[PDB]
Design a protein around this ligand. Sequence first.
Ligand SMILES: CCn1c(-c2cccnc2[C@H](C)OC)c2c3cc(ccc31)-c1cc(O)cc(c1)C[C@H](NC(=O)[C@H](C1CCCC1)N(C)C(=O)CN(C)C(=O)[C@@H](C)N)C(=O)N1CCC[C@H](N1)C(=O)OCC(C)(C)C2
Ligand SMILES: Nc1nc2c(ncn2[C@@H]2O[C@H](COP(=O)(O)OP(=O)(O)NP(=O)(O)O)[C@@H](O)[C@H]2O)c(=O)[nH]1
Ligand SMILES: [Cl-]
Ligand SMILES: [Mg+2]
Lengths: 166, 170
Amino acid sequence: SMVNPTVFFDIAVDGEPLGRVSFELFADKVPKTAENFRALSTGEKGFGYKGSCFHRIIPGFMCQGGDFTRHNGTGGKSIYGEKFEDENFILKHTGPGILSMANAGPNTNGSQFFICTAKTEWLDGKHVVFGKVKEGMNIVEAMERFGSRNGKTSKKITIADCGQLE
Amino acid sequence: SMTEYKLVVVGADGVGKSALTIQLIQNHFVDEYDPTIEDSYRKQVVIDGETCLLDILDTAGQEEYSAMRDQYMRTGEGFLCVFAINNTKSFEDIHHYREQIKRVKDSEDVPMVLVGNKCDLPSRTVDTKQAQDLARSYGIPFIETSAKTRQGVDDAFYTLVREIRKHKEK
Ligand SMILES: CCn1c(-c2cccnc2[C@H](C)OC)c2c3cc(ccc31)-c1cc(O)cc(c1)C[C@H](NC(=O)[C@H](C1CCCC1)N(C)C(=O)CN(C)C(=O)[C@@H](C)N)C(=O)N1CCC[C@H](N1)C(=O)OCC(C)(C)C2
Ligand SMILES: Nc1nc2c(ncn2[C@@H]2O[C@H](COP(=O)(O)OP(=O)(O)NP(=O)(O)O)[C@@H](O)[C@H]2O)c(=O)[nH]1
Ligand SMILES: [Cl-]
Ligand SMILES: [Mg+2]
């Protein structure tokens, strides 16, 4: 992209390298939400995604992660404070690879996010879409296979490294 | 011989549905939050001299996915409707569960127990009388519980079985 930043996650399975997933962040249309994810991926504010876990993976739906404060699926925080408002609903959950914010209801974005592995249109207007997988969808499909119907993973899937490319 | 009962635990986020179920099944409490998607458990017990196989469906507090929630209610024979005594909104949600259960099951008489959980906490916002009055208006039992101390846990589940048996006598 000439405009949108690219970030990467190096994914690990029980500490072993699985592969790299890169993401285009739609700063052109969702700038505040894209900037939060970018800065959490570089760690430039002193905290962020490196070391955190994809704690909820449900095959056919999504891979969810990003709780680096409580490490139990209830936490996370943004670069703007603990939570920030839903920026816009311009983009929709149109298929595999969509990157969108997890939340606990309206205006509760922090750091948790999910990567869709299917179209999840029922989430439109309730979760802010802000990016998409650029390279490494095969790695996301590999992560998806470690999930289960209740979201518990059979091995621990972590972000071993992350940062900004280009 | 024995009988089997399909029990479904419902109620708002964080009220203690899973903590109550884990106390019943595993006899322990850990003060950690692990938000549920869906889990099922089985336990053989004797209630009023009659051996029972309990099937327990531990649901998530969320209220999207109405097709799945409808199916939970169709399959379930009795419902533990849980609120937390320190969460007034969770108590205000209770009537919605009773309305949905009655609609899905096409009945004004569905086995249910009202459970006020977290009674060990010093931060009460829902008075016991308020919950007793609501339960009386429904004609259903009300039991205060603590998954932390185990107070009332067995009683809540066993009372629900008793309510199912009473309904089946009709
Ligand atoms: C009916 C069976 N069930 C099916 C289903 C339906 C149809 C068919 N089959 C099934 C399954 C395969 O059958 C078993 C889905 C589903 C989802 C939940 C529960 C049961 C479900 C669910 C449970 C949660 O605890 C939270 C969420 C969903 C939303 C989730 N937020 C969180 O995790 C947040 C944290 C993020 C930052 C803030 C803290 N927390 C913990 C909460 O919000 C807690 N809550 C709920 C509250 O606070 C409310 C009450 N105020 C979130 O943003 N995402 C991103 C988008 C996906 C979603 N998760 C998720 O997992 O969808 C799974 C799936 C798509 C499979 C839907
Ligand atoms: N003090 C106290 N804490 C409790 C009690 N029951 C549950 N908790 C705590 O409250 C939190 C939420 O409990 P949990 O059982 O997971 O709630 P839930 O209703 O299953 N939530 P969900 O709908 O997301 O699955 C946890 O921290 C748990 O330890 C109780 O009786 N007393
Ligand atoms: Cl959801
Ligand atoms: Mg639970």
